A paper describes a structure:
Human feline leukaemia virus subgroup C receptor-related proteins 1 and 2 (FLVCR1 and [name]) are members of the major facilitator superfamily. Here, we show that FLVCR1 and [name] facilitate the transport of choline and ethanolamine across the plasma membrane, using a concentration-driven substrate translocation process. Fully conserved tryptophan and tyrosine residues form the binding pocket of both transporters and confer selectivity for choline and ethanolamine through cation–π interactions. Our findings indicate that both FLVCR1 and [name] operate as uniporters, facilitating downhill ligand transport independent of sodium or pH gradients.
We determined structures of FLVCR1 and [name] in as-isolated (without exogenous addition of ligands), inward-facing conformations at 2.9 Å resolution. In line with an alternating-access model, the inward-facing conformation of [name] features a tightly sealed extracellular gate created by interdomain interactions. The interdomain interaction between these two motifs is stabilized by a hydrogen-bonding network consisting of two pseudosymmetry-related asparagine residues N110FLVCR2 and N332FLVCR2 and E343FLVCR2 (TM8) and N239FLVCR2 located on the extracellular loop connecting TM5 and TM6 (EL5–6). Furthermore, we identified a stable interdomain salt bridge between D124FLVCR2 (TM2) and R333FLVCR2 (TM7b), reinforcing the external occlusion.
Residue numbers in the entry: 78 to 291, 295 to 502
Write the structure that this text describes.
Amino acid sequence: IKVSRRRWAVVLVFSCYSMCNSFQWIQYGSINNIFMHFYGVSAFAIDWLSMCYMLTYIPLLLPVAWLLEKFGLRTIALTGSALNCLGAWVKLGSLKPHLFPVTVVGQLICSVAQVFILGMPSRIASVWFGANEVSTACSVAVFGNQLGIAIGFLVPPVLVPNIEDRDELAYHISIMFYIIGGVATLLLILVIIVFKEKPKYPPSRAQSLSYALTASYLGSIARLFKNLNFVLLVITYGLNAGAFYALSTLLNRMVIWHYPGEEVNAGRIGLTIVIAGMLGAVISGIWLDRSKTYKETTLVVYIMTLVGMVVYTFTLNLGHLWVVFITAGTMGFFMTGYLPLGFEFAVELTYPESEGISSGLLNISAQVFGIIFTISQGQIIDNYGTKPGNIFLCVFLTLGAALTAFIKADLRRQKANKETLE
């Protein structure tokens, strides 16, 4: 068994166009107050450019999983990169005040490519890396996707200033679309020449066993939904992860409403939320591995997410910009840090069911609640101001905190692991 040096280039290029794809998800929500003026549509319409990523994930998750297991890894990788590249070039045809529907068509194509990209953070690690490197390679793939959102907040406010003149505003928007289109096309060329179908030699003994080994999705889903403990965890995971999508999409609307101007600083808050959360994941992941106390750390971290919202909700309008950075950073520190806790707690409760099925339900719950929260909070912000909009998320996250408390620590995988040893 020998491993090839190509394994690091495979993840590096994958994390690059996953970074580009995540940029296009939030490139409209970071400058939401600017795209409203360019196209003349309301804030609800601009939020759809960030929510169509959520909608397409729900029905396309299962077929893409079947496609990935059928046509291999390279075919899905080419499809995901080409659609991401194709969607970026379609957007450049929408550089007119009246061509908003062209933007939606272009973003929907990028929305389809999101499913083909988020489907294999882990599968790339299995095929290309040995048993020791599976854990770190899977995190690097997720590392790029999260870092794309951080770039997606900081950059658009710098490239696109708040100009009343549509004709001059279109040039600045054109620069942003050209760079993303150029990067996506440049990475699409890279995907063609590096991503191969499989490494020349197996990377680990398990992969050799996996290749030699070579029920249905609906059969598994029935059994997981019989686990009451997992059903509660699915709901609580959706409330937390969905609150992240809702707040990220509406972050520009909340910040600009209380601080006129300062579009560039609103992007910095978005970067602060993501970057702090990226540090939250590694701390929570390391702590959970060492302590192995899945139930207690899930409740403590989930409560801190509620505490983050409470301090964020009331300190946003105090009139101080720096305190928003601290409150949003702490708020984002625990929201993204809860994601590794939810995944590990779900696999622990659903043993020996496949991790892909368990993680798929959590992701679907995240997108379903992301659409509900974004729609409901948007109407509340429009009609009742931004404070009831954030309070609405605080109330729901409080409901999730109680539901998590009733989850029984049925850590059956830990029981199974010690059973094999004895």
